[PDB]
Paper text:
[name], a Tier 1 select agent of bioterrorism, contains a type VI secretion system (T6SS) encoded within the Francisella pathogenicity island (FPI), which is critical for its pathogenesis. Among the 18 proteins encoded by FPI is [name], which is essential to Francisella’s intracellular growth and virulence, but neither its location within T6SS nor its functional role has been established. Here, we present the [name] structure of [name] from Francisella novicida and show that the Francisella [name] forms a homotrimer that is structurally homologous to the T6SS baseplate protein TssK in Escherichia coli. Each [name] monomer consists of an N-terminal β-sandwich domain, a 4-helix bundle domain, and a flexible C-terminal domain.
Here, we report the purification of [name] from Fn and the determination of its [name] structure at 3.0 Å resolution. The structure was in a homotrimeric state with dimensions of 86 Å × 82 Å containing three [name] molecules, consistent with size exclusion chromatography. Among the 398 residues of the full-length protein, residues M1-Y268 were resolved in our map. Each subunit of the [name] trimer contained an N-terminal β sandwich (residues M1 to P146) and a middle 4-helix bundle domain (residues Y159 to Y268). The C-terminal domain was not visible in our 3 Å map with C3 symmetry indicating the flexibility relative to the N-terminal part. Interactions were primarily through N-terminal helices forming a three-helix bundle and middle 4-helix bundle domain, further enhanced by domain-swapped-like interactions of the N-terminal loop with the adjacent protomer’s β sandwich. The interactions for trimerization were largely hydrophobic, with some salt bridges and hydrogen bonds involved. While the overall folds of [name] and TssK are similar, the two structures differ in three aspects: the relative orientation between their β-sandwich and the 4-helix bundle domains; two insertion loops present in TssK’s β-sandwich domain; and, consequently, a lack of subunit-subunit interaction between insertion loops in the [name] trimer. Whereas the basic side chains of EAEC TssG “LG” repeat residues form salt bridges with acidic residues above the N-terminal domain (NTD) hydrophobic pocket of EAEC TssK, the acidic residues in the “LG” repeat of these “outliers” may also form salt bridges with basic residues above the NTD of their corresponding TssKs. It is noteworthy that the N terminus of [name] is largely consistent with the NTD consensus sequence of canonical T6SSi TssK, including the pivotal residues (W8, L14, L19) that contribute to the hydrophobic pocket interacting with LG repeats of the TssG feet. Francisella [name] has highly conserved NTD residues in the same positions, and we have found that replacing any one of these three residues with alanine (W8A, L14A, or L19A) abolishes the capacity of IglJ to pulldown [name] and abolishes T6SS IglC secretion.
Author numbering:
A (entry chain C), B (entry chain B), C (entry chain A): 1 to 51, 58 to 88, 94 to 268
Amino acid sequence: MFLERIYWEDGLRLDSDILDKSNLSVLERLSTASYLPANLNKGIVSFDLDVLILIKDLKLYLDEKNFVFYDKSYPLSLQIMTEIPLFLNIREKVIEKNGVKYIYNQLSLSLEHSYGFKHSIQIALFRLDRGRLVPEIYDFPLLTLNHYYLGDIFVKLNRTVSELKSFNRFVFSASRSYASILLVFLINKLERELKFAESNRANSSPKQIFDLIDDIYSLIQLNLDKVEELDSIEFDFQKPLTKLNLLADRLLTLCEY
Amino acid sequence: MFLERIYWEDGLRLDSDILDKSNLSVLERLSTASYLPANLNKGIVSFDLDVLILIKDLKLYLDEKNFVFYDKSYPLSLQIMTEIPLFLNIREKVIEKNGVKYIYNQLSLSLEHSYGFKHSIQIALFRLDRGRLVPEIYDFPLLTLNHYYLGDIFVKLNRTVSELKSFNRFVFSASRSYASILLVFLINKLERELKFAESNRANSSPKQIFDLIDDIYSLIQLNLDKVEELDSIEFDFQKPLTKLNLLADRLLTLCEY
Amino acid sequence: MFLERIYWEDGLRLDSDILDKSNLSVLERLSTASYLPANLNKGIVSFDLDVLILIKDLKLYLDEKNFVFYDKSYPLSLQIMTEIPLFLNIREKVIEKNGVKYIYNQLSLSLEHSYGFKHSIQIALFRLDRGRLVPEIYDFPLLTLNHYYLGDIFVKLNRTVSELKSFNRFVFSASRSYASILLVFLINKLERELKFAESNRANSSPKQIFDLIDDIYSLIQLNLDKVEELDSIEFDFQKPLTKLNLLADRLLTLCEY
């Protein structure tokens, strides 16, 4: 049910309930009318942690375009002790500032899902071996590229670029000299995009990188002279990191020859 | 005139009129400040109908960034009887929910323009032959790709891809072997983009598809060895479906040879 | 500190201060939740001047996503008399419309920074020689392409396209016939993009043009047979015009041979 705005013209004794309802309706209406890139309903715009789990930057969109922002006023840590899911808890509370009451949102971390909270959504997956807490991939859309898992992806992509250069130099150029120029062209394009993306994390998206890698993969398959059936992977806005990892692994497997 | 926010500091007897005016001003200000992709003022984000005209999904932005959403609470049909324009009517009405009055927007369908309504904008064009109601192209910007007319476009594009493959295999490769590799590359790129777009309708735009088709067209014209004058068509954000149809028709005409 | 919404449930004598605070908090919350392309915090969406400095169109986002709009109700001129910085001043004032008080934002132009104003941000740089006021490049992000400085950039880009065609026709094609096809392809792509961008200014961004020019530059460097070290320039969302000018100048310098 889409309620538009509240109806004031009737006239009634101004109580707190009607004002709170009006504010809530206005907020809901304007949040619904808002737009996100690629018409997404939720995503992560920034999420970084210290490398005990300590949160430095947290900014994301929950389901139905709910905005969550983390103030640096209080620490956000869990400090586990001994497949470990990580959950985010949002509880509202009343605080007073310079003589005026307000409504605040308090963030917390828990090991499992909890009740009695406004929101409880899993945001990360962690696996520990001898107390190391190796990060793990979790399926969630992200809008920007400044995610804590992107370091491993960048290292793997640099290794893939080096492997691609070696593969083109050694055997691919000798067999098919015609497509070698286009392959070098696309490799340089990917390298330039990676160099730009590493320096600027908040102004990039995974779709461009996935498109470049997929294009490089398809170009090799077309002239590979192997079986005519080519395996195609489609990008998914729900699991982008998984698709990037699978594409990189397949590219490395084909490049190792 | 850009009114920013209302001025409360004067102090006055709190009547319903001032509260309604404040809410309206806040809504107008925040709607004006909003942003849409490619800096558009209106567009269609989702519009699907059953295949009597029955509406299943309706979501679009009117002029001056006005947001219209269709609740599935009530049916939305016209049921014509015997170039048939279709119009959308918006009338506001007062409803009460759990003891609180609200303002609701009611949607309706009419054969022609009507007065006495908040909005009356034509959204579709229909032509019937022996009571069939064949869909017709209407000029209106759309943000996503889930429009009811995209099925015919997808079928035509698949046929165009097959025709392009046949044309490249038969005559184009034999005459110009140099550009054949690039042509096959671009054809595969278009095929991959089409495969992704068909599965994911809400996360795609017509501009990418138009760019790919136009690029394929230009590549053929450059090495076609025919008259040096090449006909170039520019994408228009006001009539995207028309441009797509014209480009596809021209590509098919050139491919039939 | 992220204050969410105001707390009304306590109940208190309804004064103007609490209503103004509630409106301000709602506006701040919804402005913070808003999103801009490439996750930018500020930018210019439209800025045109008559060619005394007379402002015709002014629309931009200030820092922290503050929206500024210029009404055509009053003139906006400076009329200097004799490195001249230009500043924008925003002062709020109370106006009354049809019996209802409101809050208005008044825009002004000044030679230097001023105090006692809500905002004072430099937006343009001008240099005069014998009273001519030649426009100068200032570093500021812009979202669309309808900026007053784009005319010179478009002229330089057309000259660059002509120079690139001449360079490819004369010497580059004779030495390396393999990459000539790809170079002509990319030149035609850039020409088509420029033709589209000139007609449609409000629906384009500098990133696409920069990517096309950089791609053309890299393709030439790869097969240039000169020193293997290639100079790469990265696009910056903070100084896009500067990067475009530097890339165009370097391309012209390399093309002159």
